[PDB]
Amino acid sequence: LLSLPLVGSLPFLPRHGHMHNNFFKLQKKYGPIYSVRMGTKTTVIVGHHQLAKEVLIKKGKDFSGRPQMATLDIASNNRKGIAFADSGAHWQLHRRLAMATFALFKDGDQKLEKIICQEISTLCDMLATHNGQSIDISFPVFVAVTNVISLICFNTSYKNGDPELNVIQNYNEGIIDNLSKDSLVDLVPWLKIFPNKTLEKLKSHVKIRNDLLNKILENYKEKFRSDSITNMLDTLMQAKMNSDDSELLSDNHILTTIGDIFGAGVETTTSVVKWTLAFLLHNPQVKKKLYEEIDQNVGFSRTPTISDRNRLLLLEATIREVLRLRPVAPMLIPHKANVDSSIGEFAVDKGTEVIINLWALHHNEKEWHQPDQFMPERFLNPAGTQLISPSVSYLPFGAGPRSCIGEILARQELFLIMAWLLQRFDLEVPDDGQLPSLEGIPKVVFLIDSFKVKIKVRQAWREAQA
Numbered sequence: 321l322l323s324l325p326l327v328g329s330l331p332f333l334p335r336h337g338h339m340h341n342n343f344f345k346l347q348k349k350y351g352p353i354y355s356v357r358m359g360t361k362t363t364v365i366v367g368h369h370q371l372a373k374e375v376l377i378k379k380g381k382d383f384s385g386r387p388q389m390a391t392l393d394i395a396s397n398n399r400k401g402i403a404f405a406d407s408g409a410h411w412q413l414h415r416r417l418a419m420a421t422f423a424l425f426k427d428g429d430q431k432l433e434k435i436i437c438q439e440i441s442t443l444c445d446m447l448a449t450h451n452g453q454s455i456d457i458s459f460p461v462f463v464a465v466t467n468v469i470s471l472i473c474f475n476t477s478y479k480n481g482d483p484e485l486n487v488i489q490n491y492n493e494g495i496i497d498n499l500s501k502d503s504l505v506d507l508v509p510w511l512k513i514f515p516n517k518t519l520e521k522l523k524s525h526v527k528i529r530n531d532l533l534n535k536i537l538e539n540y541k542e543k544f545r546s547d548s549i550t551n552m553l554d555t556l557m558q559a560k561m562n563s564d565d566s567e568l569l570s571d572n573h574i575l576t577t578i579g580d581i582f583g584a585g586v587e588t589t590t591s592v593v594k595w596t597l598a599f600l601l602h603n604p605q606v607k608k609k610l611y612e613e614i615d616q617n618v619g620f621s622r623t624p625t626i627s628d629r630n631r632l633l634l635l636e637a638t639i640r641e642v643l644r645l646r647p648v649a650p651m652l653i654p655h656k657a658n659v660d661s662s663i664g665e666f667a668v669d670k671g672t673e674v675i676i677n678l679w680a681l682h683h684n685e686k687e688w689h690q691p692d693q694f695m696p697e698r699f700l701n702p703a704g705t706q707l708i709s710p711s712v713s714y715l716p717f718g719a720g721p722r723s724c725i726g727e728i729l730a731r732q733e734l735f736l737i738m739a740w741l742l743q744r745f746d747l748e749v750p751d752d753g754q755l756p757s758l759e760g761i762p763k764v765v766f767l768i769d770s771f772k773v774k775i776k777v778r779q780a781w782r783e784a785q786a
């Protein structure tokens with residue numbers, strides 16, 4: 321009897337299980353590197369730290385491109401900005417200027433610590449009014465980090481109850497949900513095969529965001545002083561007047577860069593905060609010691625500063641541990657080969673798509689002890705007196721040309737938020753018995769199912785007010 325003709329073949333089922341984990345499972349059969357061909361596009365997947373650092377660092381310039389996608393084109397205004405732009409003059413320029421702006425907050429008046437703590441304070445006040453109740457903390461946190469990133473881009477911040485915050489929240493959730501059904505890595509291109517209204521919806525959410533950026537520019541346009549350079553829109557409008565690289569600083573090119581920064585700044589930070597609280601509800605023992613640590617090394621004489629990350633070591637290890645278990649980007653932003661190159665001495669043609677399975681690096685059992693468990697202790701020496709780096713297979717913020725540019729902002733944000741809340745609130749399981757599911761929801765960002773927290777002001781915090 322003959323075998324039957326085979327038109328196509330995929331190694332696992334679509335839309336079954338998370339993509340980053342189905343790839344990681346295949347490595348038992350095929351090794352840490354393998355490829356898939358979808359028509360003419362060929363995709364290479366990589367799930368070992370040595371091969372990944374070759375792609376990201378050693379040959380980082382050979383694989384610094386970005387593939388083209390229908391949804392990303394719409395959300396990137398046709399591959400402008402940074403995250404979704406291909407490697408070239410536009411991406412080079414805007415990435416540098418964005419990195420350059422972050423320098424404007426090292427210390428002084430707008431010391432990033434000051435801006436951040438200004439909004440955490442307002443955050444804690446609004447939360448303290450819910451003393452005794454179970455709430456979803458997504459939106460209060462959303463507002464806090466929305467204002468930090470707004471002060472950094474525009475030197476403006478939204479007053480309490482500004483409906484424009486709810487409008488931003490709305491299209492942020494619309495874009496994220498239509499950008500990709502699950503992760504950005506989809507074997508089958510479904511939206512080109514079946515009749516669907518996906519791109520129509522994405523265009524309409526994008527339209528509301530873009531029309532909002534145009535209005536924000538036009539007012540700032542008639543307020544820009546070439547001597548005042550206090551934010552990112554200044555840094556970007558400055559470089560424009562100098563070009564008269566004028567072609568790559570058009571109004572849209574600036575629009576899209578601010579967009580990638582405003583977006584990333586809110587959605588990544590908010591997501592990691594929710595993940596952290598969720599893990600601590602499942603891990604009361606760790607939470608208790610976090611209270612102990614912050615009470616011993618900060619007490620209640622003052623509110624926590626960046627300085628405290630030298631003595632609040634367990635809180636640092638908890639943040640590092642969430643970024644390992646539930647990376648914001650378990651497969652990063654897909655890369656592309658700008659030229660013919662190789663990985664582990666394997667041929668890789670120009671234009672090939674390359675994906676680093678960061679989920680695989682963070683769960684490699686030869687590199688981590690019990691990687692499925694949430695053990696912040698793994699980042700502490702056995703005595704708990706100094707942070708460590710237990711595995712080289714650890715890259716929450718990526719590496720190389722395409723690495724995160726908001727890491728400094730991110731780490732300071734996550735630390736100050738968690739330190740202020742733990743100093744001040746008992747964060748307990750709601751009165752109903754429900755805990756948050758840690759399974760997660762893979763989108764362009766690795767989100768968690770929304771959940772509620774019973775929040776109480778700490779008795780230790782009430783005392784010391786006398």
Ligand code: HEM
Nearest residue numbers: 402403581584585588648649652653717718722724726730
């Ligand atoms: C815990 C928080 C965060 C994590 C874990 C994280 C991680 C990452 C990763 C893994 C990448 C790309 C890796 C790759 O493509 O090779 C990336 C890129 C990027 N991140 Fe984040 N990030 C975080 C927060 C932020 C924040 C707060 C900002 C604020 C501006 C930001 C802005 C960006 C941008 C613009 C890119 C694109 C880089 C490029 O394409 O060259 N990220 N981040």
Ligand SMILES: C[C@]12CC[C@H](O)C[C@@H]1/C(=N/O)C[C@@H]1[C@@H]2CC[C@]2(C)C(c3cccnc3)=CC[C@@H]12
Nearest residue numbers: 395396403491492495579580583584587648649
């Ligand atoms: C999609 C978006 C969040 C929703 C906004 O309405 C549009 C944002 C964007 N405009 O198209 C830029 C995206 C951001 C989502 C997060 C992104 C993809 C991001 C990132 C993602 C994961 C880790 N670090 C950074 C870079 C661009 C950021």
